[model samples]
Target: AKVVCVLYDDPINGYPTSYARDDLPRIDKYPDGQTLPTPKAIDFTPGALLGSVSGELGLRKYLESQGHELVVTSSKDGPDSELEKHLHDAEVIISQPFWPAYLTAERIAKAPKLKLALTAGIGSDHVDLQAAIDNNITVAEVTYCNSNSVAEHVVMMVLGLVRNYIPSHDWARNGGWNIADCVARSYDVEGMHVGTVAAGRIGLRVLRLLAPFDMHLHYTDRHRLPEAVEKELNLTWHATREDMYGACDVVTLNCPLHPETEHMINDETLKLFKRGAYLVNTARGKLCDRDAIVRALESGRLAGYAGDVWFPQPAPNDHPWRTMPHNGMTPHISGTSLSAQTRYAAGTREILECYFEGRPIRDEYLIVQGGGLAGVGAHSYSKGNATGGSEEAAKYEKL
Candidate 1:
């Protein structure tokens, strides 16, 4: 029997040390699916969500019924005495990008029996893809499952910042009733021209979702969307990000971070956008220069900025975004909603079931599966030239 190690994120504050449950978003108001984080919230140890979703969604109890031991942990950033000891013979490892268990190449060399790596949701940059393939370890993720969820999150943040929701709410709570205070800060999104960098699943979803609001949607992607989809959504495609930003009142980032994309939204990129335009990012945080973002906000070049994903998880207390004004940022919670939890957990289990049964992974989920890396995930996500084998590909292949 094989063992599957599932490590969920622990509340950074550590239970009892801080808040009761900081892992989940506050959802007392939306008890019945009114909003994103609904009642079925499960931020359990990495395996807990899986255990909850097993019976539903056709997620069979394959491992448990087969007597294979499943170990769950919150020790994502390993080097832990306990996690290191258990890492000895684990067959499969599961992790999430939000609270990633970064499987560095050196760490990959230590796990001999690790055959497959699964990400609960989208984004697998946490794992070393090339190392997995070299070691013949199958790596993949449940692709496109949470794009809508995350896209909606980006839209929500944009609205929150543009409308000055947080500050207004604070004012109301403090018994300071002043209409001018909130009205002067709030702005309408209806007539604004908004753009996203990538028109992939998430970007396309953002366009379609924002279209009904009467805002013009624009996008810039290496591969453009179908003409019909673009026309139906009233999207204006741009050949370059410069053109897109020039035409947009708000520019939301929804692209993957590659060699070319890292810090693509730096001081230079912000300068190209319409002055006082808002910036929204639900994609990888590293894509934007955090320091540059603060500078833009401070200089009034950017009216506001909002996002949930951060460059490095558990951003330091002194991270600029935390104190940046006119910014709406939260801990990475866009793709980890309760609804997303159900889908991604089931998806993660499906990948594990297929890997252990000696079946090829679904092409849609295969980022670095097969012998050598063959998709955009391979070339775009590599670390400089080649290094040891590609066994590290199996780590966090899901994102």
Candidate 2:
């Protein structure tokens, strides 16, 4: 069997300074020279040394022992055009959420021999999941692979927003010492009621992580967790969105976008959040109405909105979110941390072991395995490509 690994390979491994850091004075700055800790993008190389912490290197080695072939590529979306040439021969293709290969329906149809798609991490939206299902190509991912990573990011972003980290850090760097300007807008995470929509692995983790913060944690999901787990986490469960948003001061989204959740956070829902409430999304971006979130931010109704995922993986330069007001958005990166890479790399290989051995695939990680939407994909698969319909699967589905 031949497998293709598509991962991000940065030309430079050194941390790049943020735009805000460029003008800041060097005094009292982080040693890395940025206000916030720099996230290193993966470096992709041909062989020997690893580039990105994606795909299962362990699994690749295991498969090779069984006489399977693995071919890896970097920047597969760029104009190299090499992947297109090799598509038909690659039996299994592996990808990551951090850097993605845009597998369209057209591309899936073109790959005659491609029988499997694996996401080394959570969210297999990089491939055309439905198309893969139609093709009978087995699709799988590590469902809870990086829930902890993303949940932590959501907490950090909530702090970034409520505490005004982005702007305040800029002020300190620009030689302006207006402490009041930054702190006046800042508030403590303590006593704030932080709520989440679609409280599953990541959502519940958010609550568990926040337990020591002294903030009230609340959540709403289609399926509720056991009462004991909620009690242990000190979580307040809401039966519906109306119940959650009506009271939550800081709302973090941990839900997948499907028919029910598509743009569920649009203008109508935005109005439901506490006035001047903060919003954090480490989940799919399409779950919230893009323009509505911006409008809420601009209107000062929403104190802040932070997210790690976007409608498109490599969001176009002019995407509205780029310039959205009071946003702490970054490219979809919360789940691709180097620490996460280690776990996902191992998990991907574990999935392949079953695939190659004809063993039953783990039920939790199985999405679009035997077809349609199974496991996580059953609830996450959507219709419209990017509006949570299409974009939802792109962010979470194995296909």
Candidate 3:
């Protein structure tokens, strides 16, 4: 018998209505301008649901009917978590980027039967790729499942921070009319030099969206983009991060978090930004140094900071970023939008289908195959792709 282990967030409310398909919450729009039936604020809070939501539970019935053992849980952190208990014997493991069950080398060593690691969404940096390569465990994710969703989020945050939307909205809710204070920092995005750390799928999409804004666009990537596209967008490519950061008024992080990128936005690099510049990250929480960001905000080095990623999912209520000034942060919801959820859940089912049928997974989705990078992962995560916690996989390390 095959055992599949799944890790996901818990549901917000009780079971779905009988006639309703897809038991998740229905996001409705209101008569007012705002999107209605908003995901309850509690959904963003940590440790609230502690029950299974998303496809993890949806998949239980299908897998069970197929004579497979399906184990699902929200308790994945810590050594004694439920994931650790069943991981050693599980043939396939399903995890999501939002509430990841980090698969480190230490745990990988314990799971001799582990054959596949599947990310329900994009970004497999949560797993130790080098360790997976060494162990011959194939790792893959739902590629392009939520790339545009994240790109839209990056644009929203950039505008939010640059225009100081948060403070202005706060004043309206408080019944205060302080126009001077609101506009004191708010500025238009036009003519500002905007750059991305890595111009891959998400980064390039951001530039394309921002092209109409007439801002001077810039990016740093391992490979240069097509000349015609660059010429049309009027994009400038920097050979190094230092050069790119020095010129931008706003920098959005779109790079994957690995050894080279961990704390990539530390004190030293923070100095390269234009003073009081805005920053946005829709990539990974660990990419930015927590303390360095707080310091930059406090000292006015960055005009504002905005992102949907945090170092730890369900960041403690007391997390400094939560209370920090000139900051716009959300629990990691940028990639898991309702639309993206549908795509990834279906992609999860597709991966499992291929696995059970002994068919090959699409190359675009493969992050690690036969002890090496195979598809887009080869270019996107070729370097600094490991967690760098162990020395054993050093020879195979990309950084």
Score candidate 3 by lDDT: 0.76
Overall lDDT per candidate, in order of appearance: 0.68, 0.71, 0.76
lDDT of candidate 2 at residue 235, scale 0 to 100: 79
Model 2 has an lDDT value of 0.71
TM-score for all models, in order of appearance: 0.81, 0.81, 0.86
lDDT of 1 by residue, 1-399 (tens): 455454444434432323234354333222112222111222333212332212222233456676677666554442443456666687777666666656667767888888776776787766666577677766677776577789789889888988889889888999998889887879989899998888777887788788888998888988778788877887788999888898999998887765567778888878898889999988887788778999999899998989987756656556689889887889888887655665566566666666666776666676676666645466335532122222332232122
Best by TM-score: 3
Q: What does candidate 2's lDDT look like per residue over 1-399, in tens digits? A: 888887665435533323232231222322223222111221221122222533334455566778988777764653345567678788888888766666778778888998778877777666766687788878788766567778889888988998899999999899998999989889899988988887667777778788899999888877888878888877787889888997888988887654566688899877788889988888777677778988998899998888888776666567788888788988787887655555566567667777777787676777786667777677766632332223332223211
Report the lDDT of model 2 for residue 350. Answer: 68
Q: What tens-digit string does per-residue lDDT give for candidate 3 at 19-81?
A: 223345443431222222111111121212222453352566667777988776766666566
Ranking by TM-score: 3, 2, 1
